[PDB]
Design a binder for these strands. Structure first.
Ligand SMILES: [Mg+2]
Ligand SMILES: [Mg+2]
Length: 249
RNA sequence: AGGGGAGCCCUAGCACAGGUGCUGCAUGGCCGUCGUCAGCUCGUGCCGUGAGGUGUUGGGUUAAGUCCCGCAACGAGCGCAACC
């Protein structure tokens, strides 16, 4: 049953039958206290820390600060970009690079090739040598973009970090704290609530939680201070958040 | 008449020429050779008390450290290639 949330998209489900001899284990469902992914233990402990954290995201915001989020799991990545562009800041989906922060003065160079290439495919210099290098410059521009598509907003090392799972993207969190950078992350029982600077004890995994915690973390920024504007947002045309703007091919 | 004097010839004395006369285990120079083999390194960062390691390992591909993907590394140089 899809409570107006599922939407009938002619989803067959012919190959989706439970004929997968799934009728094999009785204890198949070892079930615990994790049936939908919404845990809040001790409350007087977590809610205390939340206010804490979210009070800073607000501060770093107003102080003009910057917050690059760090995403690495498939269980996020894209969920990192939406909350990325919606909130004008740098993000890292694909993969971290040793030094992303403890080497700026060098990884930032890559960012430069990137921009450099991005210039050339805009001037008449297009096509002046063998297709080979033409592609030699396309591979790069392409790759570079794959791994640097979000680091282009880091003219200088950031005031904070928002890594999802400070245990899977630990290098990130190492590099960070080695440079006195408050590290903000999700974290759970299977994490280092000692390393995480400003914790938000959500579910490390679980798409939903992510989008839930990461969004307000994005909205809180945006709503930093305020203003009038009371005609509210429109529904169906929420494309500026990114969605799937203009395709190529 | 003749005398002085410059380039030069000759005897004599001298500084010295000359020497394929030793030493290439004193050397430059140039060459051979492993090897036309695919390799040898550097910057920055990270690991390590340290010598150092990481990158240059791994899967795949290549005539090739050639290229791909991975990865605490990101690059760059000499070489490979291309230029002839
Ligand atoms: Mg070939
Ligand atoms: Mg060869």
């Amino acid at each position: 049953p899809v409570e107006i949330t599922v939407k009938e998209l002619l989803e067959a489900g012919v190959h989706f039958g439970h004929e997968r001899k799934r009728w094999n284990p009785k204890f198949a469902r070892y079930i615990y206290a994790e049936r939908n992914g919404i845990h809040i233990i001790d409350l007087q402990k977590t809610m205390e820390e939340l206010e804490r954290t979210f009070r800073f995201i607000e501060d770093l915001a107003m102080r003009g600060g910057t917050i690059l989020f760090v995403g690495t799991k498939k269980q996020a990545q894209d969920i990192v970009r939406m909350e990325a562009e919606r909130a004008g800041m740098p993000y890292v989906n694909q993969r971290w690079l040793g030094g992303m922060l403890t080497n700026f003065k060098t990884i930032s160079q890559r960012v430069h090739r990137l921009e450099e290439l991005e210039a050339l495919f805009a001037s008449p210099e297009i096509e002046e040598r063998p297709k080979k290098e033409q592609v030699r410059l396309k591979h790069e521009l392409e790759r570079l973009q794959k791994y640097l598509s979000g680091f282009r907003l880091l003219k200088r090392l950031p005031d904070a970090i928002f890594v999802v799972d400070p245990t899977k993207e630990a290098i990130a969190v190492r590099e960070a704290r080695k440079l006195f950078i408050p590290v903000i992350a999700l974290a759970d029982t299977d994490s280092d609530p000692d390393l995480v600077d400003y914790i938000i004890p959500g579910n490390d995994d679980a798409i939903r939680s992510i989008q839930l915690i990461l969004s307000r973390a994005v909205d809180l920024i945006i709503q930093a201070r305020g203003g009038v504007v009371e005609p509210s947002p429109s529904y169906a045309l929420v494309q500026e958040a990114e969605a799937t703007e203009t395709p190529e091919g």
